[model samples]
Target chain A: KYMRINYYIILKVLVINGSRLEKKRLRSEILKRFDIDISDGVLYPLIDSLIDDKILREEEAPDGKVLFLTEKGMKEFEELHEFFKKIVCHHH
Target chain B: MKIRKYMRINYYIILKVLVINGSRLEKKRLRSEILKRFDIDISDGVLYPLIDSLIDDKILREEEAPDGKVLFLTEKGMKEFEELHEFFKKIVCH
Candidate 1:
């Protein structure tokens, strides 16, 4: 339960672009940033996993559902990024 | 969930390689180990940025080597490795 690499990155995808990001944006950005096209089967379950954990807030919008990372969600990202910064490198 | 599971493996594999290889290694050696661990071909496009981010964060520093670049883990990085390894061990034990 503690190892949440996907949840971690999804929150990151949201945070990296902006606080308020649409599901569509998340899909494209995942491919853009991570080079992985997340299939619908995997994407929804992943989003639901975060929502289920109370780390993300989901709501309907005029266009579609928008996802927001709550304070609790933000905290985990910072913490994950903390460790992430500790391990990963910047490309030149 | 499945894609997430699949995608996150590389990030974990990269860090675990550094943790296992100790403080310094030739870049190719590190890359080789990562490729060997996964038994898959990881492109430079993916691997390069990850390493670059590591350098940007100061977890690793690069130096000139006979073959190419060498990566040195900082003191802070070693501390991070200790903490991260602990987290991994907890997952294993669970």
Candidate 2:
């Protein structure tokens, strides 16, 4: 019932993928793939929220603060994964 | 798999409250209660969508009354509230 474009999705993407590649480049790649122009206003708050939740960790980089998942973040993702499997997978 | 997992974080600021209050509460009443407890200034946009998310998932229900609709927990919601209650309690107490 809420707007589809919340930042939690972006937060998850950063956590799940940040460990593997260049954070901004990968974020740009994802934005281009989804055809969404992510702005600093929206992007920053979402990133900040994740930081607040301990869902994402931001380390100072020359470019800016780079983001990745903390252990608590991984646990949150895993919990959601199990719930989805329980809800949707059983129907198939 | 990861995207789908993130998609269902509940996004429910109200269920966040019901878990704290654990009883039937009016919409405005719940908002006030949340503000009192969390001390975070929440707006209507943030509140309604959250309540709606719970309603959509059968985690919460609403009733018509002389005033605005009242909100209450479903069975699943109660279960969820307990989970949230314990988790929050552990963090705060520890």
Candidate 3:
């Protein structure tokens, strides 16, 4: 459950910025902000699962594979962000 | 969080720790330590409910102290802890 929440939070960062992120950048950002470290093996499989669910899609950038949330994902992220805040703080 | 099972396991682990550490802990310290060790952010909403449930279930007993609420694992809780530890290890390992 906690693991899934982190995945959604990574997606939320993309939703807010409207910028895509490569795997390495995402991993670093998540660690920097949350102090939660996830290895490539653990992280990539989770990202792949999100892609399978169509919550995110990848773009082939000149530098690397960058990821962006799909429209469905954005809607879900909006809902999820509020949900996370509510649960984490127990108040809106 | 998946509230039902995982939270129960969470409560079980806390009780397990209490038993191992002389069967008592200060509430505030226990809360912080659990969050840090599990690497999961838990809200008071989720936490208090589980605490209450464990007390009701006879797995845990609470005592009021000068500092704050002190939590202790019951004998039943100790037995459950051994089972939970074994189960939790297997799940994490496999």
Candidate 4:
């Protein structure tokens, strides 16, 4: 099984940025900050799944759609963050 | 399409568990500890193949113990874990 750490990074970026972003901005932000290039094929499908899961919601913006994390997404992020912290702490 | 079943997060969790548990654990104990700590139920089917991949990658090795085989992180595995930890710190640690 491959780990999609990039997915976690996407959630982290949204969480850090007030839980909302345009898809283009989100992709660029990740590329600039994390240096991970997320192609449209991967990013769009993942976003669709998150929307299906109700972890994210799509809304119409003037230019395009905006993505916002639903309550479920935030909770998921918090749980993952806590688990990651625990793992790191154990190492130290 | 369904979300991918094989998440790299699970692999890292396995590595982290071994690291925290002194770099070695019986397979059964590893599964139980993962379920206990992360609430992730890695079934035998998934866990065994995952372990095999790690072994194939030289990240882990198995040694016969009194009861059964125990899994130990090879030096390469420790390095892999450390690299992952650093990456996580960059993203998760702000």
Candidate 5:
């Protein structure tokens, strides 16, 4: 029930797909891959927080707005990946 | 840095560590294992309230042992661990 986990999954989705995605595509991908029904209220604020922290940036594209990871965001994602691996993978 | 975000991550790590250590651990031993394995030094103030929330949620239960209190994962806790484990695995393996 922690929102942070949901946020982490969002980051994972973005990173796994080469670190850039339109908001609508991101939402659909999360639903398809994780079965998490994230509403605009929840998802938009989460994205905004990431942008506020400089983990992600918004850019105007021809078709729509795209979100791309800042260098710090990629570093954070890698750090989180290692942290999860240390606790989850080591046990198995 | 968001304290709330970091605390939630600590909670996840705590649950994962409990699952790995046979789903039960003495309070002190659990702290030591977390420190040893993840280099996370969980202070008593943070860990105690965190454990209480888990207990309230029925994810964990406290039992009296010969030396002190021990923490055991309830069925709900096991399921919680599985959910997180699967989620992380999918992301990593995808």
Candidate 6:
């Protein structure tokens, strides 16, 4: 349930930004900034899946790999962004 | 800059690490690290997609070994690291 919300929040951001992200630094940041909590059981594998999907990109780091959105992923987010603008944001 | 913050995942987790990071992760260490990260004393999930993702990233190259394959990073991946580095600098620093 929490993961679903997390997923959508991420989707919305990626769509607007034209890319993907991974393992964001949200320790001192708020949800409005990055909106994720890394201690959940998901900080790793789902990252792998996103990498596989080419939705997000990952990079190696000392503590762990850093993840981000991909160009292909960005294209998908563009489609999503259009939808949000059409259906959700304009009404406001 | 908009992404989720929950830390839960399954399968192919280690593979992704090798993809973004170097492929120097030892199998024994990878298993224990993942177990600890997930906070699971008991085990029950597949770690293949992680492996497959690494393969896809070309960041992970399989080698001949008793455990099936040893992992190594590719040259293309090395090049991509430059871009990854720049992205983090922009996001984390700014």
Which candidate's DockQ is highest?
A: 4
Candidate 4: stretches off by over 4 Å: A1-4, A89-92, B1-7, B32-41
Candidate 1, residue B93: the lDDT equals 20
Residue B58 lDDT, candidate 5, scale 0-100: 85
Q: Which candidate number would show the highest lDDT if scored against the true structure?
A: 4
TM-score of chain A of 3: 0.79
Best by TM-score: 5
* Model 6 DockQ vs. reference: 0.05
Per-residue lDDT over A1-92 for candidate 6, one digit per residue giving the tens place of the 0 to 100 score:
34543443454555444442335542323245553344435544555666777777777876655557777766765675453333222121
For candidate 5, what is the recovered fraction of reference interface contacts? 0.22
The residue-level lDDT of candidate 1 at B27 comes to 86
lDDT on C-alpha atoms for all candidate structures: 0.68, 0.57, 0.65, 0.79, 0.77, 0.48
4 against 6, candidate with superior lDDT: 4
Give TM-score, chain B, model 2: 0.70
Q: What are the models' TM-scores?
A: 0.50, 0.43, 0.49, 0.76, 0.81, 0.36
What TM-score would chain B of candidate 3 score versus the native chain B? 0.77
Residue-by-residue lDDT tens digits, candidate 3, A15-34: 54574677668877766644
- Tens digits of lDDT, candidate 1, B16-72: 677667777788787677667545467888988878877788878889877888888
Q: Flag the better candidate by lDDT, 5 or 6.
A: 5
TM-score of chain B of each: 0.72, 0.70, 0.77, 0.85, 0.80, 0.49
> Model 1, range A1-92, lDDT digits (tens) per residue?
32355566578788877767898778788777655455666578878888987888899997989999989889988887765544443211
Which of the two, 1 or 2, has more TM-score? 1
Better of 4 and 5 by DockQ: 4
Q: State the lDDT of candidate 6 residue by residue for B1-94, as single tens digits.
A: 3332212233224433444345565444555665554343434344555556656657556667776556676776444444444333333322
Looking at model 5, residue B68 earns an lDDT score of 87
Candidate 5, position A35, lDDT: 66
DockQ of each: 0.06, 0.05, 0.04, 0.34, 0.25, 0.05
What C-alpha lDDT, on a 0 to 100 scale, does residue B34 get in candidate 5? 81
User: What DockQ does predicted model 1 obtain?
Assistant: 0.06
